[PDB]
Structures are given as structure tokens and as C-alpha cells.
Symmetry: C4
Subunit: 165 residues, 4 copies
Amino acid sequence: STINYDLSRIKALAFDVDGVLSSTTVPLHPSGEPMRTVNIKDGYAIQLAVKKGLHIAIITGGRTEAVRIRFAALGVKDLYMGSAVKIHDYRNFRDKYGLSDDEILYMGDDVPDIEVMRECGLPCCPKDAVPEVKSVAKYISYADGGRGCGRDVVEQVLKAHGKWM
Amino acid sequence: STINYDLSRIKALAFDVDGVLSSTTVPLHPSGEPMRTVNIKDGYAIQLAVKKGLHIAIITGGRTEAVRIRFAALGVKDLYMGSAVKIHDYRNFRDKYGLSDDEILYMGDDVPDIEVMRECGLPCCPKDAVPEVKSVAKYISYADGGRGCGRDVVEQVLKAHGKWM
Amino acid sequence: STINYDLSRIKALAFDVDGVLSSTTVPLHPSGEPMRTVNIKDGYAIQLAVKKGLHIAIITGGRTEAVRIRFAALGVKDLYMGSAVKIHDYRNFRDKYGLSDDEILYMGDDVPDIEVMRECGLPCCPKDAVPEVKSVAKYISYADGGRGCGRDVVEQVLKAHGKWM
Amino acid sequence: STINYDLSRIKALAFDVDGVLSSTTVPLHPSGEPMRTVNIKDGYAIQLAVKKGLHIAIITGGRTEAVRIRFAALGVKDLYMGSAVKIHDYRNFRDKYGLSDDEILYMGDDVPDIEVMRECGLPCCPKDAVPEVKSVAKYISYADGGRGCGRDVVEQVLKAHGKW
Ligand SMILES: [Mg+2]
Ligand SMILES: [Mg+2]
Ligand SMILES: [Mg+2]
Ligand SMILES: [Mg+2]
């Protein structure tokens, strides 16, 4: 669905990992660390978004190594991991590029994402985000976490800039 | 749907792993041992529950270091792995904290869980639990095993205590 | 649903692996070999069946150690792997135990299973089996392949024998 | 068949991997490399098609040895990998066998597949292909990417050849 926001002023998109770029339910590695998922259609749009000049960030509380490598390989340079207080890292990201809050989209799925979602210009969440998160979101994707909700908003922003084709 | 029970009486929540906190269908590791899944929304609620003073136990026949690690990383201290007859680990958990049965929730999915479910105050099960288990459950989650039925009940109990942050 | 057959007469149950006890869509191991999935509810019933004196076989074109190890661990001794022409292995299984066709259930999902299904007394298939297989099946499980169709039929047969609870 | 095309004309089927023969959402290997999925019903039909003399190609931007070995093991002899320019793989595949466009089916799921789909005779896509891909597809499978959309078209073509 189209987002209730002037997407033309979005210059940056930030994402939670678990329940957003990765599925909420994932296999467990023998090591005890979650084996995350990535969505290939998410991937296409994200690498394109980086090529077209949008600042992309991931902000996660874990040390999700495999996710770091994958998105690094997509050109994403702002990878905030072990983010115990996400709002502090969001601020770092915003200020690093001299952005205003109204220029940043953030997509989260669970309560540790709420503080950022309250400060960012365009809070978004997947179709299966928790109710507390849906109530703070300006847009709720048609797609569940890990299954194309990233592709959804990235494609919308790129199209609105005429940078999709 | 709220659980038909006075959740303020619940001081402890115990979970089967396979089919409850981990999906019923899982990848088979090349070793021939099943690879459990974890749900990150479950995880958030579980770790918060521990912090808020709810007692949390997992009780599983499984012996994999992955499951032990993952739950110990959430602050679960009562990890009953390699469980042969679950009722004993249930009693152990109950008695360790001076609980009565009516103060304990147990969530199971299959026949080996029935004995504990008959004894605990608040038996539940996921949406896709087996008939005999649904039969004895006071509450059936809206979520399938591994897909957030853990999150469901932990949150409900935390909310009823005024501890849902 | 329930099987339209006199299950008290069934003395043995044989299963294809891929697409029946394992999902049709599976992760690809880096070695180039498809991984398999297993279902924990299938497992409980299968190990129970062996304990209740029912003859259990798997008949698969696959050859992976993981599959062999997993089913052996459930106590399954009739492991027909690398099965190129399944009818030979079905007949070997039947004649091994002096069974007649009407005493054997076989569950398959694809064309290579059809010959065995035409011969066994009780051919079954998962909900997502191919239409040619559904055409020869006397029973279609409510469950997709890998997701509990094994449990479905094993449990029905054990209950018929009064060997469930 | 239920595809609106004379499938007996199709002599070759080419498939994108990710989002078509492998699922769109996949597990991540600890190396940071996505782990593809395969569908066992796709597999049976693919190996049969090869046996019945249909030309099969897989066209993918990836380079993983796993996808290489798997499809090789199914008898697939035309494995286009490491590719970025899909139209070139398609044209090379077509010309290798002296085919005309109308004799080739191609199934893709995303924007980079569009150029090929506009050139091939029978462009198909999975049920969850992006909307731009759906608008150029002659046929949209009932199956999601990685979940039997390959089996769908291969089987329909083999049936129309009387080779099923
Ligand atoms: Mg999250
Ligand atoms: Mg269980
Ligand atoms: Mg099969
Ligand atoms: Mg693709």
C-alpha cells in the first residue's frame, strides 16, 4: 500500500534485523546463535537504494555477524550492532549525515524499536509487528517480517524519487 | 483472547521446547539431530520475564548445546535438558521456589506433556498442539508451536502483573 | 479426516521420505545435497509404533547419513535407502514379515511412489501430493508433506489397535 | 495447457534461481552467503525433462557451488552462473541450440528478469513475483517462488509433448 508520507523527503532508511529484515522464527545454529534469513527481493532493492544515494542503516541489539557481512556486501555502510539503546544509534546515524528526523524512515517490529519509531519521521513496521509497535507506526507493510517488508518500503521510496527505473 | 485464569496468581512459567518454543517441523542437521528454531519475539518476552522476577523454565528431552546456550543467553537459569519423565523436572522447578501448582503455567504440545499439564495450575499449548493436549489445556494460543505462542502467554502474564514494561 | 479403511488390519506402515516425512521445499546444503526436514510429532508416533510392535519402513531414493541416523534413532530398522525402484523394496518389506498387501499402509507424494501405492492395501498421501498420486490414494492427509502427515496416519493406526494410550 | 500457449512448441525451459527455483526468503550461512532452497517436486520434473530431451537452463547471478552441484546432479547441462546480464545468458542458450524465441519458456520473479521475459516466447513467473514481472508474464504460476512453480510449468510442457 502507499505510505502516508511525502516520500520525496526521505533520504535515509533504517532497519531492525530480527522480525524485519530477518524472519521472526529462524533455525538455531549448533553454536546457539540464530541462523537469520535474508530476502532476495529485499536485497535487490537495498543494493539499488545504496547505489542511488539513499543512506541505509541497520540497527540491531545483537552481534548478528552473518547479517553484517551480507548487507556490507550490499553496500550498506551504517551497521549498528549490539545496539542496547537503539535511539542513541539512530541519533548517531541521523547526525552523521546532517539529517533531520523527518528525512528518516525506520522499520521495527518489537518494543525495543518504539523509542526510535517515536523520534523518526516515518516509522514503519511489518504486517506481523507487535500491537505496541503497530500503534506507533505511520505505515504497516503488507509483508511479514523477513518476507519482503524491506523491499516494500525501499521500493516505495525509490519510486517516489524516480530512482526505481 | 485472554487466558481464562487469574494470571496474577502465576509466578512461574515452564515450557516444552520442541513444538512449543521451537517449530514442530525443523531442518535435519547432517549429524542426524534435528535443528531447533527460535522465535525472537518469544525471546524478548522471556528475557524481560526473567528480569521482572517471573521464574522461567524449559523442560525438554533434547540435549543439544544450541538450545541450552540460547536459553541461558536469555537469562533462563532453570534449563532441564535430557528430561526423561517431565513431571519430575516440573516438581523440581515448583519446589525449588516454594511454589504451589496453581502458581505455575506449563505449555506443552504432545502426549509426553500431558502429565505435567494435568498437575500444573495453568496448562496451555500452541494452536497446533495434538488433540489430547488441547483437551487438557485451559488455554490454546493463537500461535503455532515455535511461532510465538511463547510470546503470547509470557506477555499475558506480565501484563496481568503490571510488569509489561 | 479419518482413514476409510479397517485399520485394525494394518500391521505395517511404510513411508517415502522426501515430500512425506520431510518437506517438499528444503534448504540446500553447501555440499549440493538437499537437506531434509523432520517433524517432531511424526517422530514421537513413529518411535511409539516401533515400541507397539508395528513394522515401520522408510523407502527413499535418498542416501543421506542424516536421514539414516534420524530414523535409526527412532528405532526404525527397515531403512530402504538409495531406492531406485521402490516396488522391490516394498515387496521385500512385505515378504520379510510374511505380510499380505491389505495389511500395509504406504504414504507417497510423487510419481515414483505410484507403483507401490497401487499394490499396497492402504495407499495414503500428504495434502500437497501431486494429483496423480492423489488419484491412487485411499486417504489424503490433512497435513502437507513434512508437516505431520506421518503423525496423522500412524496415530490413527495405533488408536485402531488400542496401542495409543 | 492452463498456460495460454501451445506448449508443444516449447523445446527449452530456462529458470532464474532465486525467487523461482529457490525461495525468496532463505537462511543465511554464517559466511554471510544466502543458502538456497530446492524443491523436490521441481527436481523430479527437471530430471525427467532432461531425460525426454527438453533443453533446460538455470540462469543465476549467484556463484554458489551448491546450486551448481544440485542442478548438475539433475542432469542440467546449461548452468549460467556469475551472470549479471541475464539477456546474454538467454540469447546464448537460445543460439547454442538454434532455437527461436517462441520455442523457449523463461520464468523469473524480479525486475532484472524483465528484459529476458520480453524477448522469450513464453514468459512465466511465480505467484509471488513482483507486480512489474507479473505484467509481462503470459502465465503466473499458482505456486510461490521455490515452492513448486518450476514443477508447474515443466510438468505442463511435458504433458503437452506427451512425454510425461
Ligand atoms: Mg526485531
Ligand atoms: Mg514438544
Ligand atoms: Mg517423495
Ligand atoms: Mg530471482
